[PDB]
Amino acid sequence: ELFHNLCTQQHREDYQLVMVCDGDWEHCYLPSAFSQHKVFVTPQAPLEAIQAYLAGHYRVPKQTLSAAAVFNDRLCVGIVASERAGVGKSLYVKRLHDKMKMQLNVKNVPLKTIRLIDPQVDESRVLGALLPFLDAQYQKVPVLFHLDVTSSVQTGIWVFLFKLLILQYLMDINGKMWLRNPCHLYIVEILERRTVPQFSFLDIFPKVTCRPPKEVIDMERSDTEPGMDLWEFCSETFQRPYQYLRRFNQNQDLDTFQYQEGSVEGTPEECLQHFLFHCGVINPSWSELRNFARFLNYQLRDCEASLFCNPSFIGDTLRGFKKFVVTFMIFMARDFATPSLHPFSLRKRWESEPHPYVFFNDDHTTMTFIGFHLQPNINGSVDAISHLTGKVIKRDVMTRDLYQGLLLQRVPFNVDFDKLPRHKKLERLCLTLGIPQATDPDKTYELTTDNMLKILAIEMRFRCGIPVIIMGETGCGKTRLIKFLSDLRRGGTNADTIKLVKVHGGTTADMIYSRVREAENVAFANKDQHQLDTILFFDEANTTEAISCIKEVLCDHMVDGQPLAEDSGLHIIAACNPYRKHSEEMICRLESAGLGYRVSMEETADRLGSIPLRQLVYRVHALPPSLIPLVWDFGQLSDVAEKLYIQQIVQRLVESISLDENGTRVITEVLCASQGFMRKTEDECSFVSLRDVERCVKVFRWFHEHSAMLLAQLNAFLSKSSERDPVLWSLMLAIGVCYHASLEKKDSYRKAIARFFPKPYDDSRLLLDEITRAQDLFLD
């Protein structure tokens, strides 16, 4: 309407106007109105021409003091891209900032970092973050803007980059406006979202492609295809493992070798070759390789500080100790470095692999051996065997001379932590962790070898600096283990050494940032007062898209672009729920419930790509690909452990209400049978946890409390239509509420459960009868 009206009025009679539409949607209003005007010579340019055009426009003149000076050829815009995660995009921007601080002679060169976490790009948040810089001091001073477009972003990215980088502008509801100044550099950190034409939109831009180690060796210098950073290669993390490995592979004697601080040897290429050979991953990222290096460095450092490697002090009975240490630790790293996950490419199990751990205790005089035993063979060599089955885990980890020597040193080989007493377990565990006192915080937490190994894994990751991301079902033991460890390290002190955040779909980035900053203050306080490390724990973190913020906290070690303060003692753990899909029968039952769903699986926008989330047992969003190599399974809750927790709950009830042992037995057996049946019945129940047993016990307790009145009213009601144990009766009604009602195959459940009930109540019919009578009484 307005176009036609203006054309009727005194206007530009040579106006140049263009409209552009998506052919699939072209049937709509504005393309329809001008269909006659449809232009059939669609303008196009080859990618190289657009590249040269934008590169010319981005090029900052030499006279202009610009952050661009560091970038390729004074381009005030750059894209840093990777086909996968953790290959040096943020590192590249860091080094760019540093080089800018070196070159530009400026007292301060601001870095602004912006995280785009929302699936649909929020340009108003970007504008809000940039507006502080509208001040004039910045208009003639270099500033670097780093915009990280996390994996969480799915839509709005190309439009946003077009407007900001090309149109040089952003604008909001109120009317305040951002102008992209050429004196400032813009770098976009993005993962190449390859799925679409012969060229990706990002290619139009000055791009840096950061490459992984294997691509760095194979393909290779340039600033648009960086290799191994020299500060990292010259860092202790790479150099100690590199020097040790360099000697190891050549079969040199390490009996004398000791890494001298600040030393640097070899070349980036040889270091990468050795790391990739031993790493265990075929095409690792740089993060996986640093985690490998960081682990091997920490443990080799502790070995160097130990007495078994001190100036001899033991003669030569320990010849080959460092050779053994390097071999074993390269094997041990397999658990910490290697991924455990391989639309639903995200799954594996904990019991699938051994966890042979060796630790150097903070006393620098003892070692801890867990998860494996040493067995001598006829060939004079010593092998690593599974402590459970005795099967060989790794052959020739050491020679028999070193085994006998280490025995003479009282090193605790072949220890069976499952047969040890409680306090001996606590002593070994605390010594390994570096705790002086075996202050047992929970006698019901069973310190089995597996749980101790889990604790020690979390500990090593805390020590070296590998992020801790654990995957497990609800009630598999994560929160109790973390609590146990926090309490053990606390040692009775009155301190808040652990903060637990229960993450939900509504957990926003600002909530995570605030929680982390609060935990950081709390940790500074705790370390000052009590000298205790602090844990922050995110449970159900994948449940939110703000999980990308959690990635920043775990991997990037930052908070909304601001860095985390080391010297805090704050450790972060994240627990992610698993990625499972409901069975097809179960999805049928769900789609058939009532009038069915309001939206079909096709029309949904709530999905994990191909999968609607309602078809997932857990509403979980996709993991940032950087966290994928780090997630390790906590393990499934064993039948023995389930029964033990049920027994603990029923006994807690016994003390609360003074039941007998017969009722305890029956309640335990019926709760176990109920959980078993619901687990087997994958067509009606996909989710089973101990929270359901707590709920059923709560209901049982409620029925037991009221049982006097309910049984009186029941006898009266039934007399109107002219004996019972309160415990078995309340159990039956609790079972009714928790399991029997939601079910469709109620009869099979009652048949299974009845067998555990004492006579004469061991009948499915009596069970249904009592449930019916109680329902009637409640209607009456």
**90 in a labelled binding site:** yes
Closest CA to 483 of 496, 466, 494: 496
Q: Give least dist CB 555 to ligand ATP, A.
A: 6
- As given in the structure block, the two tokens for residue 329 are 């630790």
Q: Does 85 bind ligand ATP (CB under 6 A)?
A: yes
Within positions 690 to 719, which residues make up the interface with Mg ion, using CB under 5 A? none
**86 in a labelled binding site:** yes
Within positions 535 to 564, which residues make up the interface with ligand ATP, using CB under 6 A? 555-556
What one-character-per-residue DSSP string does 280-335 give? S-SS--HHHHHHHHHHHHHHHHHHHHSSSSSSSSSTTTTTTHHHHHHHHHHHHHHH
**88 in a labelled binding site:** yes
Residue with tokens 């946890």: 689
Q: Give least dist CB 564 to ligand ATP, A.
A: 13
Within positions 612 to 671, which residues make up the interface with ligand ATP, using CB under 6 A? 626
- Phi (first) and psi of residue 192, to 5 degrees: -60, 105
Closest CA to 420 of 395, 389, 452: 452
Selected from 76, 228, 397, 753, the binder of ligand ATP by CB under 6 A is 228
**247 in a labelled binding site:** no
Helix 726-735 × helix 764-779 angle, to 10°: 80
- As given in the structure block, the two tokens for residue 493 are 């002190």
Could you report how far apart the first and last alpha carbons of the chain are, in Å?
69
The binder of 85, among ligand ATP, Mg ion, none, by C-beta within 5 to 8 A per type, is ligand ATP
Q: Give least dist CB 98 to ligand ATP, A.
A: 14
The binder of 428, among ligand ATP, Mg ion, none, by C-beta within 5 to 8 A per type, is none
Q: Does 229 bind ligand ATP (CB under 6 A)?
A: yes
Selected from 186, 202, 209, 232, the binder of ligand ATP by CB under 6 A is 232
Give the C-alpha distances (Å, rounded to integers) separating 772 from 103, 701, 755, 777: 84, 20, 20, 9
Tell me the residue number closest to Mg ion, measured at CB: 90
Within positions 163 to 192, which residues make up the interface with ligand ATP, using CB under 6 A? 189, 191
Question: Nearer Cβ to ligand ATP, position 468 or 555?
Answer: 555
Stretch near ligand ATP under the rule CB under 6 A, chosen from 97-105, 225-233, 445-453, 761-769: 225-233
Stretch near Mg ion under the rule CB under 5 A, chosen from 89-97, 299-307, 533-541, 635-643: 89-97
> How many CA within 13 A on the CB side of residue 131?
13
- As given in the structure block, the two tokens for residue 761 are 């109540």
Asked if 354 and 453 count as a contact pair (C-beta separation under 8 A), the reply is no
Q: Does 113 bind Mg ion (CB under 5 A)?
A: no
The span from the CA of 576 to the CA of 573, in Å, is: 10
Q: How many residues bind ligand ATP (CB under 6 A)?
A: 20
Stretch near ligand ATP under the rule CB under 6 A, chosen from 34-42, 226-234, 350-358, 377-385: 226-234
The binder of 88, among ligand ATP, Mg ion, none, by C-beta within 5 to 8 A per type, is ligand ATP
**229 in a labelled binding site:** yes
Question: Nearer Cβ to Mg ion, position 90 or 686?
Answer: 90
Closest CA to 144 of 107, 179, 96: 96
Work out the angle at residue 450's Cα, subtended by the Cα atoms of residues 445 and 455, and round it to the nearest 5 degrees: 70
The span from the CA of 332 to the CA of 324, in Å, is: 12
What one-character-per-residue DSSP string does 483-524 give? HHHHHHHHTT-S---EEEEE--TT--HHHHHHHHHHHHHHHH
Question: Nearer Cβ to ligand ATP, position 284 or 356?
Answer: 284
Stretch near Mg ion under the rule CB under 5 A, chosen from 37-45, 84-92, 127-135, 428-436: 84-92
Stretch near Mg ion under the rule CB under 5 A, chosen from 8-16, 87-95, 303-311, 610-618: 87-95
In this structure, how many other beta carbons lie within 10 angstroms of the beta carbon of residue 15? 9
- Taking residues 90 to 109 in sequence order and writing x for each that binds ligand ATP by CB under 6 A, - otherwise, the string is xx------------------
The span from the CA of 66 to the CA of 104, in Å, is: 8
Three-class SS state of 372: coil
The binder of 229, among ligand ATP, Mg ion, none, by C-beta within 5 to 8 A per type, is ligand ATP
Q: Does 86 bind ligand ATP (CB under 6 A)?
A: yes
Q: Give least dist CB 148 to Mg ion, A.
A: 6
- Taking residues 270 to 289 in sequence order and writing x for each that binds ligand ATP by CB under 6 A, - otherwise, the string is ----------------xx--
Q: Does 467 bind ligand ATP (CB under 6 A)?
A: no
Give the C-alpha distances (Å, rounded to integers) separating 566 from 11, 157, 519, 557: 64, 33, 13, 9
The span from the CA of 692 to the CA of 474, in Å, is: 11
- Taking residues 491 to 520 in sequence order and writing x for each that binds Mg ion by CB under 5 A, - otherwise, the string is ------------------------------
The span from the CA of 88 to the CA of 227, in Å, is: 9
Q: Give least dist CB 121 to ligand ATP, A.
A: 17
Selected from 146, 207, 290, 355, the binder of ligand ATP by CB under 6 A is 290
Question: Nearer Cβ to ligand ATP, position 207 or 322?
Answer: 207
Question: Nearer Cβ to ligand ATP, position 90 or 449?
Answer: 90
The span from the CA of 242 to the CA of 230, in Å, is: 14
**151 in a labelled binding site:** no
Asked if 523 and 534 count as a contact pair (C-beta separation under 8 A), the reply is yes
Which residues on adjacent β-strands are paired with residue 571? 535
Query: Residues preceding discontinuities in the chain at C–N > 2.5 Å?
Result: 195, 220, 342, 722
**724 in a labelled binding site:** no
**189 in a labelled binding site:** yes
Within positions 191 to 220, which residues make up the interface with ligand ATP, using CB under 6 A? 191, 210
**91 in a labelled binding site:** yes
Report which DSSP code applies to 339. Answer: -
> How many CA within 13 A on the CB side of residue 270?
14
Selected from 88, 142, 284, 635, the binder of ligand ATP by CB under 6 A is 88
The binder of 286, among Mg ion, ligand ATP, none, by C-beta within 5 to 8 A per type, is ligand ATP
Q: Which long-range contacts (CB under 8 A, 24 or more apart) does 732-736 make?
A: 732/757, 732/761, 732/767, 732/770, 732/771, 733/699, 733/700, 733/703, 733/770, 733/771, 733/774, 734/696, 734/697, 734/699, 734/700, 734/703, 735/670, 735/674, 735/696, 735/767, 736/771, 736/774
The binder of 232, among Mg ion, ligand ATP, none, by C-beta within 5 to 8 A per type, is ligand ATP
Stretch near ligand ATP under the rule CB under 6 A, chosen from 28-36, 82-90, 321-329, 427-435: 82-90
Q: Does 90 bind Mg ion (CB under 5 A)?
A: yes
Question: Nearer Cβ to ligand ATP, position 82 or 526?
Answer: 82
Residues engaged in binding Mg ion (CB under 5 A):
90
Under the rule (CB under 6 A), what is the footprint of ligand ATP? Answer: 82, 85-91, 189, 191, 210, 228-229, 232, 286-287, 290, 555-556, 626
Binding residues for ATP: 86-91, 189, 229, 290, 551, 626
